[PDB]
Amino acid sequence: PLALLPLKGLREAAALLEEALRQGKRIRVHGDYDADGLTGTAILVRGLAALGADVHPFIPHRLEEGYGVLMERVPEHLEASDLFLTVDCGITNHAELRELLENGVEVIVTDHHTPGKTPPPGLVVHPALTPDLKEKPTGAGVAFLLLWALHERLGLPPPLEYADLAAVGTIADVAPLWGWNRALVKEGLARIPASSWVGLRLLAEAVGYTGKAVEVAFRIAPRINAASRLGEAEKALRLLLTDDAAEAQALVGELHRLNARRQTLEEAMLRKLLPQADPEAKAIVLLDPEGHPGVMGIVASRILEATLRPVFLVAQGKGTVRSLAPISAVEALRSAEDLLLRYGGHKEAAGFAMDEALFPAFKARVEAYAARFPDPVREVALLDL
Numbered sequence: 438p439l440a441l442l443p444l445k446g447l448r449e450a451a452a453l454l455e456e457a458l459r460q461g462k463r464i465r466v467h468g469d470y471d472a473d474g475l476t477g478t479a480i481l482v483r484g485l486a487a488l489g490a491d492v493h494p495f496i497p498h499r500l501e502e503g504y505g506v507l508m509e510r511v512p513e514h515l516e517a518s519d520l521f522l523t524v525d526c527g528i529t530n531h532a533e534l535r536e537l538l539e540n541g542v543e544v545i546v547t548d549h550h551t552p553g554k555t556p557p558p559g560l561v562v563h564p565a566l567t568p569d570l571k572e573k574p575t576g577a578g579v580a581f582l583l584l585w586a587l588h589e590r591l592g593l594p595p596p597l598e599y600a601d602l603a604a605v606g607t608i609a610d611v612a613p614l615w616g617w618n619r620a621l622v623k624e625g626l627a628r629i630p631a632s633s634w635v636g637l638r639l640l641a642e643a644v645g646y647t648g649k650a651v652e653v654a655f656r657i658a659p660r661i662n663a664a665s666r667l668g669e670a671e672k673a674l675r676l677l678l679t680d681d682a683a684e685a686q687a688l689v690g691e692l693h694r695l696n697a698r699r700q701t702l703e704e705a706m707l708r709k710l711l712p713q714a715d716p717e718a719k720a721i722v723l724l725d726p727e728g729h730p731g732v733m734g735i736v737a738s739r740i741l742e743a744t745l746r747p748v749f750l751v752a753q754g755k756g757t758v759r760s761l762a763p764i765s766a767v768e769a770l771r772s773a774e775d776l777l778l779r780y781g782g783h784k785e786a787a788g789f790a791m792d793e794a795l796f797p798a799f800k801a802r803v804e805a806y807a808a809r810f811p812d813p814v815r816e817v818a819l820l821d822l
């Protein structure tokens with residue numbers, strides 16, 4: 438049964454929010470552009486506003502600026518808020534220490550992604566930093582809990598009215614769905630048909646939602662994620678806020694387009710690139726001069742799943758990477774570094790930019806790099822698929 442799951446930080450957070458409410462502070466909710474993040478952002482933005490707060494959302498542009506809090510827009514975050522609230526990001530954006538410094542903007546970091554060495558500055562609400570807890574809530578999950586807590590003090594009923602959104606974000610992030618997640622999802626799914634948010638009702642209707650969870654995961658979530666991938670996140674967020682049946686359906690249709698267009702672009706890129714793969718290579722290094730970068734990542738993962746080799750795709754001047762077993766995406770990019778303009782990431786995934794003119798040289802460098810190291814087949818349980 439749904440219960441306000443512990444979580445080390447909620448009390449302090451709720452405190453800070455109520456404080457903001459009374460003082461009429463400007464609250465900027467900085468979420469992610471994926472379904473979990475957008476959905477979570479919606480919860481806090483409506484919830485707070487519902488309690489007469491001064492809230493406005495802020496979503497990054499997946500294609501121009503990356504994920505998380507962007508340092509370049511920090512100055513802009515300052516002039517716009519008194520309380521900076523993070524939704525599905527933050528824990529590794531330590532340079533928002535400038536938030537607390539530069540001016541006195543209180544920072545509340547909500548997240549669920551793998552934490553770094555040290556937590557980031559500010560009041561943190563992360564499930565992995567809660568002592569003896571193994572519930573695994575998602576970004577939208579944490580926001581829901583956060584809205585719940587704020588409801589506790591102030592003395593208002595639990596925010597069940599918001600479980601649907603929270604449910605969409607959870608399934609979207611394919612959480613275990615075995616812990617408290619189950620109660621949230623089950624409760625959420627049930628409230629979708631005729632929920633309190635037209636955008637979500639109409640959408641659920643459009644995709645013929647019956648009540649199944651697979652329907653949220655395979656028809657609803659894709660539609661919401663499709664927007665950011667084509668530089669149209671806002672459209673998705675607005676759908677989730679709006680509550681104007683008119684504007685709603687218009688948006689539902691705009692998401693239909695976006696989703697279809699994303700799918701067509703993946704299929705198109707895939708059938709152009711897959712044949713060029715070839716598992717005989719220590720690393721797959723392909724170049725689709727005219728490929729939409731907002732879709733390469735997906736294609737890279739599928740090419741990997743198919744070849745069990747590191748994949749390096751470059752389209753326009755951008756590049757993504759997906760590798761496994763020995764080879765590390767970033768470290769591969771370490772060499773050839775000179776050939777790049779920028780680059781960053783981790784072991785399994787990484788990104789970068791470069792002048793396509795150096796592609797041949799880059800391909801040979803990365804190939805040679807993976808030439809060292811064993812063959813990934815001597816590691817994966819193949820359930821890797």
Ligand SMILES: [Mn+2]
Nearest residue numbers: 473525576610
């Ligand atoms: Mn998430």
